[PDB]
Amino acid sequence: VRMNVLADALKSINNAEKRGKRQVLIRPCSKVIVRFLTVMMKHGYIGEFEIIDDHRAGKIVVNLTGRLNKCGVISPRFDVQLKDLEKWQNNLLPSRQFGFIVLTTSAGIMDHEEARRKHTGGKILGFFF
Amino acid sequence: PLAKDLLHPSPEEEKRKHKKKRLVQSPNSYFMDVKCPGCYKITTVFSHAQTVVLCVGCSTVLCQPTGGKARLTEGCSFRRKQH
Amino acid sequence: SAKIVKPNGEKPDEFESGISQALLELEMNSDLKAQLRELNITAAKEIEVGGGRKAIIIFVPVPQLKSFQKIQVRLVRELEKKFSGKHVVFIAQRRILPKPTRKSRTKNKQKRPRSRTLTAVHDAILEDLVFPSEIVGKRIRVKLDGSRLIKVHLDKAQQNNVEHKVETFSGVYKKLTGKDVNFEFPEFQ
Amino acid sequence: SINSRLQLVMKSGKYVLGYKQTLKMIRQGKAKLVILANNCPALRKSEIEYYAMLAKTGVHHYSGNNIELGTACGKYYRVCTLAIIDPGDSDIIR
Amino acid sequence: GRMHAPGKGLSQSALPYRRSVPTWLKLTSDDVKEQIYKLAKKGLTPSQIGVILRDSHGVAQVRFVTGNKILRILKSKGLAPDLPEDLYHLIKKAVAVRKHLERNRKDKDAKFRLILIESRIHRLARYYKTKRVLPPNWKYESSTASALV
Ligand SMILES: [Mg+2]
Numbered sequence: 001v002r003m004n005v006l007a008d009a010l011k012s013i014n015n016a017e018k019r020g021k022r023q024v025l026i027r028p029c030s031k032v033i034v035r036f037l038t039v040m041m042k043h044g045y046i047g048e049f050e051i052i053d054d055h056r057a058g059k060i061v062v063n064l065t066g067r068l069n070k071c072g073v074i075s076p077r078f079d080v081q082l083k084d085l086e087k088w089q090n091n092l093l094p095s096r097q098f099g100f101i102v103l104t105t106s107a108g109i110m111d112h113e114e115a116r117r118k119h120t121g122g123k124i125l126g127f128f129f
Numbered sequence: 130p131l132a133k134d135l136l137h138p139s140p141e142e143e144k145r146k147h148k149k150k151r152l153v154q155s156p157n158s159y160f161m162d163v164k165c166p167g168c169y170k171i172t173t174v175f176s177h178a179q180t181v182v183l184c185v186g187c188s189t190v191l192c193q194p195t196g197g198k199a200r201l202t203e204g205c206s207f208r209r210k211q212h
Numbered sequence: 213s214a215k216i217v218k219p220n221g222e223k224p225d226e227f228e229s230g231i232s233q234a235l236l237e238l239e240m241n242s243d244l245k246a247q248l249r250e251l252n253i254t255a256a257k258e259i260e261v262g263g264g265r266k267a268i269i270i271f272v273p274v275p276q277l278k279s280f281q282k283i284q285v286r287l288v289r290e291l292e293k294k295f296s297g298k299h300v301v302f303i304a305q306r307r308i309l310p311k312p313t314r315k316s317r318t319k320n321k322q323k324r325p326r327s328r329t330l331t332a333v334h335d336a337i338l339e340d341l342v343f344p345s346e347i348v349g350k351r352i353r354v355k356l357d358g359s360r361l362i363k364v365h366l367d368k369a370q371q372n373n374v375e376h377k378v379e380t381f382s383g384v385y386k387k388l389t390g391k392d393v394n395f396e397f398p399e400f401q
Numbered sequence: 402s403i404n405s406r407l408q409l410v411m412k413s414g415k416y417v418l419g420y421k422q423t424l425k426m427i428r429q430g431k432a433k434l435v436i437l438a439n440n441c442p443a444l445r446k447s448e449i450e451y452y453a454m455l456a457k458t459g460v461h462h463y464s465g466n467n468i469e470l471g472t473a474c475g476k477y478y479r480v481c482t483l484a485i486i487d488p489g490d491s492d493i494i495r
Numbered sequence: 496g497r498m499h500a501p502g503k504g505l506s507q508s509a510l511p512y513r514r515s516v517p518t519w520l521k522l523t524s525d526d527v528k529e530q531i532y533k534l535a536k537k538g539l540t541p542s543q544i545g546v547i548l549r550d551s552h553g554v555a556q557v558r559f560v561t562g563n564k565i566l567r568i569l570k571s572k573g574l575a576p577d578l579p580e581d582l583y584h585l586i587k588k589a590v591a592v593r594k595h596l597e598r599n600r601k602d603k604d605a606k607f608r609l610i611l612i613e614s615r616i617h618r619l620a621r622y623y624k625t626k627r628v629l630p631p632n633w634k635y636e637s638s639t640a641s642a643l644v
Contacts, residue, residue, distance in 0.1 A: 022132045025152075038358060050136060053350040054153050055512055061136050136351065140399050148509045153349055155401055155511050160519070160555075173519055178550040192550070199550075212517055339515075349512045408644070409538045477642050490537035 005030045006073045006126060009060075013046070017068045029058025035109040036102050036125055037062065040071070043100055043111070045128045071128035077104070082121040085112060092127050099129030161207035165189055174199065174207070220254040220273075220305075228256050231268065234291045244286060251276055251283070254305045261383035267299040269384060277304040277340065284343055285373070299380045303340040303388075306333045334389040341381050344370030348398070362393040371397060403463060404473050406493040407436070411475045413489020418476065420445075423484040424452065432484035433458050434494055438465035441481045449482060459495070499611050514559050524561040527554055528568055535574040541565045542580065578643075579623060585616045586635075587644045593637070 002008060009026040016024040026033065029051065037060070040046045047063030080088060080103060089112055093099030101112040105122025115122065135152065143151045160175045168186040178199035182192040192199035201207070214229030217236065222228070232253065239245050253270055260266040272280050280287070280302050292300045309324045310316060326332055338347060345366035353361040366374065378395050385391050410416065417426050426432035427449075435453050437446060439462060450460050463470055471480045488494055496503030522530075527548070534544045544565055548554045558564045569575045576583075592609045596602060616635060623629040 020131060023135060025135050034354075038354060041354065041356060041358065048356055049354055051352045051354070052136070052152060053352060055510075055514075056154070059152070140401075143401070149505070149507065153512065154509050156509050160553075162519070172551065173553045174551070175549045175555075179546055180550045182551045194550075211519070212511075212513070346515060347512060404644075413538075472641050475642060477639075 002028060004073065004075055006032065006036065007075055009033050010071050010073050010126060013062055013064070014068070014070050014072065017064055017066075020066075021064060023061060023063050025052075025059050025061045027059060029060050032104075032109070032125070033058075033060065039100070039102050039109060039111055040068075040128055043098075043128075045071070045100070068128060071126060073126035074124045077123040077125060080121050080124050082115075082119070085116070085121065088124065093129050099127065101127045159209055160211075161209060163191060163201070163205055163207050165191060165202075165205040217251075218253050218255070222255045227258055227268070228253075231256050231270065231291075231295065234294050237294070238287070238290055244283075244290070247279070247283060251279055257387075259383060259387050261380055263379060265297065265299070267301065267380040267383065268295065269388075270300065270302050271305040272302055274304045274306060277302070281343060285370075299377055301341055301377070301380070301384070302343070303337060306336065308333050334385060334391065337385060337388065338364065341384060342366055342374055342395075345374040359392070362391060364393060364395050365398050366395055368397070368400070403436070403461065403493065406491050407473050408475060409491040410485055410488050410493050414491060415486040417484045417486065418474070418480050420482055423482050424449065426484045426486060427453050427456050427458060430456055432486050434461065434485040435459070436461040436463050436470070436483045436485065438463050438467055438470045438481055440465070440467045445482070499615065510556070516560055517555065520553050520560070522553060522560070527557055527560050531557065531565055531568050532572070532574070535569050540576075540580040541569065579619075579628065582616070582619050582623065583644060585612060585619065586640055588612055589616060590641045590644055593641070 005028045008028055009030075012026055013024055034051065037046065037049055041048070044065070045068045047065050049060050049062040052059040052061065074092075085101075089096075089099070089101055092101060101124060102109065103112060103115060103122050103124045104110075105115050105118075105120040107115075107118055107120055109125070138152055144157075148154065148157050158175070158177050160173055162171050163174045163182075164171060165184060167189055168184060170185045172182060172185055172191060174182045174192055176198045178192045178194040180194060181190055182199070183190055189202070191202055191205060193202065194200070213236070214225065214232050215223065217232045218228050235248065235253070239248055252273060254273055255271045257269050258266055259269055284302060288300050288302075292298070307328055308330060309328050311330070312318055312321065312324060342364075346369070347364060348367050349365040351363045351365075353363065355361060375397065381395060382393055385393065417423050417432065423432065423435060427435065435449060435458055437449060437460060441449070446462075453460050463473075465473070467479050467481045470483070471478045474480055474483065485493060530548065530552070531544050534547055535541075539547070545557060548557060554560050557568070561568065563571075566575065589609065589612045592605055592612060596605050596609060599605070613635070620629065620633075620635070624631050
């Protein structure tokens, strides 16, 4: 069933941007969704998303742009110990020149660059690039 | 295709969508404030009835229930408009 | 004269007196009476808005709110006309408990209901502001900066009362809560 | 059927199970539905059915067993006859 | 797609944004709690009350009119049933399947619909043991079941 609500959503926003779809809604919604999408907003990977408030769960509607090649999700949230952060961002991103492993540490949800500035580890969620 | 303004969907194309599939989940049902010929009394019948709606008076019976909406009996009116 | 319909620890005369005196003035009045004896405010503030024409926000205990709603339209009409050049609106004085971190712990402390949590409060604050309009649905923007702008769909029944106000409400929580919101007057189902 | 109604009378109302009490409650006149089963042997049938007719009490020959009655009474056990004194909300009485 | 069947259907109820009462309604939190009250008294299930109250009567949802949901109104006054209505509907069903299986020992079909039904019982039961509405002891037994209805 709905186990992981990212994988759910991120499939459907990778899986639109292939078709070139202009915008998409994501059915279940969550806090973690919002908080990881707002990360994608900063590096440009999407445009402004506007969350509907069906009284229950939430829907979102994501303005897409052309720019997202793929976003995916590492499904079990392994615990990343900062020394490993490299070994991951080697084998999970296309280059050292862009690509963003979104993860979730002590000091909020954020990309790997921002966990490195603050010097924290934590749990991998996914990656967009 | 390539541009469907999902957030501002024109009123028609939610009514041709299954209740839960809509942008916001709303029902496709209603109450009706019902006259009936004998008594002037108005009962507050819910379209999709399930049970037989009897008159606040007594004798007459308003709504046989069927699959979807309720079958009003013979010659009796109703009033949607609200909310 | 002032102090008899505002009891909560908070006196500070200025408006609270003048506004409660206008409540007391509305008791010298047929039918708008007796139902007003039971009622009672707590505090009140003057707050300006972007346009210039400031609004008076009135707080209420909370259990009385559901009785203030019976009077509100008749109330506002009269004291808005009295205490002129200004908009008036009622809110319930909700508590907002802090979140129990492990830091701010669980030494004892009775629960902390959802009613009394954070996001319930500013949401019930919405239902207190636009009493006559009533909410039909919210959307919630995220601009490319990250600034979260809400959009509140209100109904239509008693739009006429509320349509002129709007940017008072926009001004209102931005003092109370700290959130920026504009109101839209839409289709039906 | 008189499983559902009877069930409700047990919980809420008043009763007497079996015999002798039931017949006393007819004697007294304070019992106004005697539920026989089938399997009440046909003398007792006719002598309760008579002995109630005279009081002016409704009788029921429940399509039962002695047992399918016990089970229906929420009793866990053999009840041939029973008498209902007072129902709850149950419209067992007509 | 359902617990125990292929059919992956969806047909459910669906409420609006709005929750605030809809102004037809007279009654008030009391007169609804006066009426739930009299129906449960007469002998109806918490579902069945919710029903009567909407079609004939007026209340979209009790929950919205009063503070709490039907079960709590019965339970806080002590008209609530012994076990959950939701469960003895399965138990009553089981005992009905039992019966005709006991006359017709060929019905292979009835010998899921029993096994399934038994399993939808046990399954239910063992939260009612962790949510603690049932005491940690009660158990099915075929024999003692027919009585329990
Ligand atoms: Mg299975």
